[PDB]
């Protein structure tokens, strides 16, 4: 009856400082469909975030892509914050330029 989301935070293109890009948060494999996803810059909710239309996989579990245009720097820290009925508290996943 319940499936916990798999969360991945990553850039659209390989990230070069000073160059425009898109920061992505892909949440997948979850059920039910209600879910809270925010992108954060230095812990603060980013306003201009867009998301894909709710769709689902062969096993009926849902997936969504949240994304925002950004220009990365060496010091700025980004993350994705997700909450879902399967999570006791919001899960924050940090953007790691390599993993």
């Amino acid at each position: 009856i319940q499936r916990t989301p798999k969360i991945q935070v990553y850039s659209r293109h390989p990230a070069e400082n000073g160059k425009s890009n898109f920061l992505n948060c892909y949440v997948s494999g979850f059920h039910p469909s209600d879910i809270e996803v925010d992108l954060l810059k230095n812990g603060e909710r980013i306003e201009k975030v867009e998301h894909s239309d709710l769709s689902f996989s062969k096993d009926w579990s849902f997936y969504l892509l949240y994304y925002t245009e950004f220009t990365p720097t060496e010091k700025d820290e980004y993350a994705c914050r997700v909450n879902h009925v399967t999570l006791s508290q919001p899960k924050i996943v940090k953007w790691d330029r390599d993993m």
Partner: protein, 274 residues
């Protein structure tokens, strides 16, 4: 090459908040091209790929009517399922439908789909023969009998064999520039330090289309996966996909491990090392 037209339709009851959520999305292969969203400013069937923007008003009007028809019957179905399972009227429940068609290079039908889920579990599915139904439980057996008696399979089969295939061909012409492409993966292995005895090798595959891909690590010829970490294939956001697979390997013996990449755009698979 083979191709698919698929729609993914989700309804969600929200008692005490108002009418159910209803959203439908359509895909050609791994490319989304339309949507209908009940929670939009002006709910209407509408393009989500640039090559759909030239279809005329009659297309969007007729498709909007059809989506609104389903919205009404999904509301009814949610209430009926609540009754079938003797559930509280206070809780939120989900009703999903997937349908569409797979076609081979000859562009005739390989497989038609019409299947449904309640609260994320199989409920009832049209079988490959497009004649009979698989019911997932005894509530769905009731539905199966109703739909058998009504002749629903014949109704759906007519869509799947005709309209579904014929519109899939039109979509593949409208989007000939982007839909018929194959983007081979750009792949590489990245080293990172771990332990003092071990190390992480991550095999990356980037910028590929279609989404289907196989990444495997092997140790001197055989295979590794029971602790190899393998993330789900993810969209880059530009119409391509990304995936990685990582293994923990003790130090000095990195040369011993190879990553192998299989993809439609790769005549022969890739063998990669750090």
């Amino acid at each position: 090459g083979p191709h698919s037209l698929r729609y993914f339709v989700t309804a969600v009851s929200r008692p005490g908040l108002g009418e159910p959520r209803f959203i439908a999305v359509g895909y050609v292969d791994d490319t989304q091209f339309v949507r209908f969203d009940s929670d939009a400013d002006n709910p209407r069937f509408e393009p989500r790929a640039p090559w759909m923007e030239q279809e005329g008003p009659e297309y969007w009007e007729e498709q909007t009517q059809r989506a609104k028809s389903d919205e009404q019957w999904f509301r009814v179905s949610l209430r009926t399922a609540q009754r079938y399972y003797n559930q509280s009227k206070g809780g939120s429940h989900t009703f999903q439908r997937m349908f569409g068609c797979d076609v081979g290079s000859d562009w005739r039908l390989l497989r038609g789909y019409h299947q449904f889920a309640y609260d994320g579990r199989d409920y009832i599915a049209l079988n490959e023969d497009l004649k009979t139904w698989t019911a997932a439980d005894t509530a769905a057996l009731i539905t199966r009998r109703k739909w058998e008696q009504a002749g629903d399979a014949e109704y759906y089969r007519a869509y799947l064999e005709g309209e579904c295939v014929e519109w899939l061909r039109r979509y593949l012409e409208l989007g000939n520039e982007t839909l018929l492409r194959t983007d081979s993966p750009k792949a590489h292995v990245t080293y990172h330090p771990r332990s003092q005895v071990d190390v992480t090798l991550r095999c990356w595959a980037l910028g590929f289309y279609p989404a289907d891909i196989t990444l495997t690590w092997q140790l001197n010829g055989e295979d590794l996966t029971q602790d190899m970490e393998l993330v789900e294939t993810r969209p880059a956001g530009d119409g391509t996909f990304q995936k990685w697979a990582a293994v923990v390997v003790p130090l000095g013996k990195e040369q011993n491990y190879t990553c192998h990449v299989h993809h439609k755009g790769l005549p022969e698979p890739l063998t990669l090392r750090w």
